[PDB]
């Protein structure tokens, strides 16, 4: 039922500027100094 | 104008519809001043 409700809500969801801002808030940087592990691992290379 | 009384309603519909499709708002002068109005129906009336 939760999955069905999620599908029903997402199929009829309209993007909003405030919702975009809050999603970016989630995506944006943090109040604590965090190391960017994603681009570090993406750009890393190991040699034997 | 042709139907002057509906101009304010048309403005509000422009404000909300473009906001619905794309996050940018036209109340900001930079977008509405030139960038958005490019999507208008021209009156050149080419004949082929």
UniProtKB/Swiss-Prot annotation, chain B:
Q: What name appears for this protein in its UniProt entry? A: RNA-directed RNA polymerase L
Enumerate the subcellular locations listed in this protein's record, separating them with semicolons.
Answer: Host cytoplasm, Host perinuclear region
Protein role: RNA-dependent RNA polymerase, which is responsible for the replication and transcription of the viral RNA genome using antigenomic RNA as an intermediate. During transcription, synthesizes subgenomic RNAs and assures their capping by a cap-snatching mechanism, which involves the endonuclease activity cleaving the host capped pre-mRNAs. These short capped RNAs are then used as primers for viral transcription. Cleaves ssRNA substrates but not DNA. Seems to downregulate the expression of its own and heterologous mRNAs through its endonuclease activity.
Concerning its family, UniProt says: Belongs to the Bunyavirales RNA polymerase family.
Check the UniProt entry and state the signal peptide residues, or none.
Answer: none
Q: What is known of its domains?
A: The N-terminus contains the endonuclease activity (endoN). The central region contains the RdRp activity. The C-terminus contains the cap-binding region.
Q: What else is known?
A: Classified as His(+) endonuclease since it has a histidine upstream of the active site that coordinates the first cation.
Q: Which gene encodes it?
A: L
**Subunit relationships:** Interacts with the viral nucleoprotein.
């Amino acid at each position: 039922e939760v999955l069905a409700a999620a599908n029903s809500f997402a199929e009829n969801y309209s993007a909003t500027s405030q919702d975009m801002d809050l999603f970016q808030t989630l995506t944006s940087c943090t109040f604590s100094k965090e190391y960017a592990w994603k681009d570090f691992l993406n750009g890393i290379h190991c040699d034997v | 104008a042709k139907f002057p009384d509906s101009l304010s309603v048309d403005l509000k519909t422009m404000k909300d519809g473009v906001y619905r499709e794309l996050g940018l708002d036209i109340s900001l002068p930079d977008v509405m001043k030139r960038i958005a109005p490019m999507l208008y129906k021209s009156s050149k009336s080419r004949v082929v």
